[PDB]
Amino acid sequence: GRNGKSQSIIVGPWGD
Amino acid sequence: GRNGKSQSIIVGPWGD
Amino acid sequence: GRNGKSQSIIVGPWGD
Amino acid sequence: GRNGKSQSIIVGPWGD
Amino acid sequence: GVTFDDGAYTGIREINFEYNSETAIGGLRVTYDLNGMPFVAEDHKSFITGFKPVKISLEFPSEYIVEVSGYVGKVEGYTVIRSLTFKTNKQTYGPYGVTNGTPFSLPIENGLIVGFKGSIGYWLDYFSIYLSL
Amino acid sequence: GVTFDDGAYTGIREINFEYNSETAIGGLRVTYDLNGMPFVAEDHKSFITGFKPVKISLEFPSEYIVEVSGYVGKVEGYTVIRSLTFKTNKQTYGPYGVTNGTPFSLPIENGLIVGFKGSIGYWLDYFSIYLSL
Amino acid sequence: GVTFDDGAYTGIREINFEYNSETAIGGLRVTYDLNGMPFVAEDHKSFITGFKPVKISLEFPSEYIVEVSGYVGKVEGYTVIRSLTFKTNKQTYGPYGVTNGTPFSLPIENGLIVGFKGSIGYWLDYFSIYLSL
Amino acid sequence: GVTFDDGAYTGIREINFEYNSETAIGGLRVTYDLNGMPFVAEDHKSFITGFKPVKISLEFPSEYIVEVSGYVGKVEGYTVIRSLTFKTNKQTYGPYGVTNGTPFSLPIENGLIVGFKGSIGYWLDYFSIYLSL
């Protein structure tokens, strides 16, 4: 937790 | 365009 | 870590 | 205005 | 119906809405979190009555919605949301309503729902979701 | 199949993928925009052949995807994406594939798709979308 | 002094604060925009009086802050903000206070200030800024 | 000098730049992280030589920059960055260069630097920073 990796909004998945 | 209103990610709409 | 609180970019503080 | 280019928060410049 | 737009907030504490097992979804009222404090948005009501209200009070902030799904369908010629299901990281709430017609689903891998906008007349006509980290 | 994750970029310039009118979606290869330059991500291929390839080269940056939809369905017991449709602010591309089963749709009111991750075996097993302003 | 954190909003409509040409900055009270409506945050007051209040009411949304700068300096052993200047896309407001000591500046090329947090005792001890698109 | 704009990435792995204890900062070359992979941006070089190069290779992703500061000053009539200091959550790198003139500082309470743009001639004329969660 709390690192130098930029976070992104991710929606899905579809197909499960 | 280019004003002081914070932008947001909006998904949808569903129901059309 | 990983909760329902929206995160924000915060710069500063200035004055320390 | 309103195109397919991802926007980013940019602070600065410093040195002017 | 009449359109509404709660705008964006810092999270969600509670969601109350109406549903009718024969027709479709009715009114909706969301209680968001605004920088740590409860913020009850305006009640977006149906033009009619005869619904059953469901009150989902999330265990904020440890509990948050990870997926919203439901069914879209025509009711008297109107295309409206007929069923809704809110899945959180703790449990599933729903489905509530008529699960017939076209299904839709918004699973969220990363991010949070921070707002709702849409339109409600006799029933919930349609709606959108604000997403943010 | 084998999972993949292109990560996030600054936009999308082109999307190439396979589809079979009888089975489902096959391989996928996206060409993103990385700070103004083309960036062709790795080709995520199907384990098999016999598909038809479609190449959607968007008119970046004036043209962008405003909605992705399609159908999910079982093919030989596997739940996979069987049909895909990419709608932009200029035109619709698709549907390509078998439009039978459970429909799904990601209309975007505001924001941009900036990445894809998922898994592909014989066909496209499932996928997610990176969203950002 | 006592810490405060207004949290994040959708913009800024007005900023009121105290300044003393001999000492430093005093109390601060911000009126933000919350999804189109005015939202006056709590008044963060100085422990003492003897200041001059300045009221900057921005022409929202056409007018927004594009840079915040000022001076940091010791006042009776305390490191505090002694001067502040708010530059918008329409005009500059300030400087107000004592412009001596260490200068600081937050020019914004792209993005918006959407919140303030900090600490105020006799004077403004320090502060941070929430940034967002 | 000649302007440059690396654009945005997913993080920073390494930063190499030139400094002269008498004049100011020289060339700059950043190695970013792009979705888990190293991505060395183009080398933005000084028009002249005679500098000392410093190579800051961050321990990505556990290590990230939490503040960038330095000094702005005139060198032969040109306003340029004369000193730079990069503080991470593990250690401080710098200051490197001439610490005279107007100080500036970008402490980051929450968020990450994901890009650099600016202009370099004989020395670093000025620069901006891309911020993101």
Question: What Cα–Cα distance (Å) separates residue F114 from each residue in D6, D9, H80?
Answer: 8, 16, 35
Is residue H14 within 8 angstroms of chain A, CB to CB? no
Tally of CA atoms within 13 A in the half-sphere of E80 that contains its CB: 24
Question: What is the C-alpha separation between G58 and G15, in angstroms, rounded?
Answer: 8
Question: What is the C-alpha separation between G35 and F115, in angstroms, rounded?
Answer: 29
Question: What is the C-alpha separation between H7 and F115, in angstroms, rounded?
Answer: 17
Q: Which of G15, G34, G62 to mutate to test the interface with B (most CBs of B within 10 A)?
A: G62
Q: What's the DSSP call for residue C1? A: -
Question: What is the C-alpha separation between H66 and H105, in angstroms, rounded?
Answer: 11
Of G56, G53, G1, G58, nearest to G33 by C-alpha is: G58
Contacts of E23 (CB under 8 A, 6+ apart): E75, E82, E98, E123
Which residues in H lie closer than 8 A to residue A6 (C-beta atoms)? 9-11, 112, 114, 132-133
Place domain G1-133 in its CATH homologous superfamily: Jacalin-like lectin domain (2.100.10.30)
Q: Which of G6, G79, G99, G105 to mutate to test the interface with H (most CBs of H within 10 A)?
A: G105
Contact across the interface for C6 and E10, Cβ inside 8 Å: yes
Task: Give the experimental resolution in Å.
Answer: 2.2
Q: Name the H helices within chain E.
A: none
Chain H: closest CA distance from residue C9 (Å): 5
Question: What is the C-alpha separation between H2 and G30, in angstroms, rounded?
Answer: 40
Chain F: closest CA distance from residue D14 (Å): 22
**Sheet of strand G37-40, all strands in order from the earlier edge strand to the far edge:** G37-40, G25-34, G11-19, G52-57
Contacts of H86 (CB under 8 A, 6+ apart): H15, H56, H65, H67, H68, H92, H93, H94
Is residue A1 within 8 angstroms of chain C, CB to CB? yes
What tokens does F25 get?
């979606």
| Burial of C5 (C-beta count, 10 Å sphere; 0-12/13-18/19+) | middle
Chain B: closest CA distance from residue E47 (Å): 18
Which residue carries 């075996």 as its tokens? F121
Beta bridge partners of G74: G79
Which chain F residue is nearest to residue H115, measuring alpha carbons? F35
Of H105, G6, G86, nearest to C13 by C-alpha is: H105
Is residue B2 within 8 angstroms of chain D, CB to CB? yes
**b/e sequence H20-46, b meaning 16+ C-beta within 10 Å:** beebbbbbbbbbbbbbeeebebeebbb
SS (H, E, C) H24-59: CEEEEEEEEEECCEEEECCCECCCCCCCEEEEEECC
- Among partner residues F104, F109, F128, which is closest to E105 by beta-carbon distance? F104
Which residues in F lie closer than 8 A to residue A8 (C-beta atoms)? 8, 114-115, 130-132
- Structural element, H or E, at residue E15: strand E11-19
- Which contacts qualify for G45-49: CB closer than 8 Å, 24 or more apart? G45/G120, G46/G18, G46/G120, G46/G121, G46/G122, G46/G123, G47/G1, G47/G120, G47/G121, G47/G122, G48/G122
Contact across the interface for G129 and C12, Cβ inside 8 Å: yes
Contact across the interface for A4 and H133, Cβ inside 8 Å: no
Question: What is the C-alpha separation between E74 and H26, in angstroms, rounded?
Answer: 67
Which chain D residue is nearest to residue H127, measuring alpha carbons? D13
Chain D: closest CA distance from residue H99 (Å): 14
Which residues in A lie closer than 8 A to residue E133 (C-beta atoms)? 7-9
Question: What Cα–Cα distance (Å) separates residue A6 from each residue in D13, H38, H60, H104, H128?
Answer: 22, 14, 11, 25, 18
Contact across the interface for C12 and H107, Cβ inside 8 Å: yes
Q: What are phi and psi of A3, to 5 degrees?
A: -125, -175
- Among partner residues A9, A12, A14, which is closest to E131 by beta-carbon distance? A9
Q: Chain E neighbours among B 1-16 (CB < 8 Å)?
A: 6, 8-16
Q: Chain H neighbours among G 57-86 (CB < 8 Å)?
A: none
Contact across the interface for H11 and A6, Cβ inside 8 Å: yes
Chains touching D by CB (3 or more pairs below 8 Å): B, F, G, H
Contact across the interface for C8 and G104, Cβ inside 8 Å: no
Which residue carries 């895909």 as its tokens? F84
What tokens does E89 get?
């990281």
Contact across the interface for F107 and B10, Cβ inside 8 Å: no
Q: For residues F78 and F59, is the Cβ–Cβ distance under 8 A?
A: no
What tokens does H86 get?
């990069």
Chain C: closest CA distance from residue A13 (Å): 19
Chains touching C by CB (3 or more pairs below 8 Å): A, E, G, H
Which residues in E lie closer than 8 A to residue C5 (C-beta atoms)? 10-11, 33, 61
Chain C: closest CA distance from residue G44 (Å): 16
| Burial of F61 (C-beta count, 10 Å sphere; 0-12/13-18/19+) | middle
Contact across the interface for D4 and F12, Cβ inside 8 Å: yes
Which residue carries 């060198």 as its tokens? H75
Q: What are phi and psi of A4, to 5 degrees?
A: -85, 20
- Structural element, H or E, at residue G130: strand G124-132
Contact across the interface for C6 and E62, Cβ inside 8 Å: no
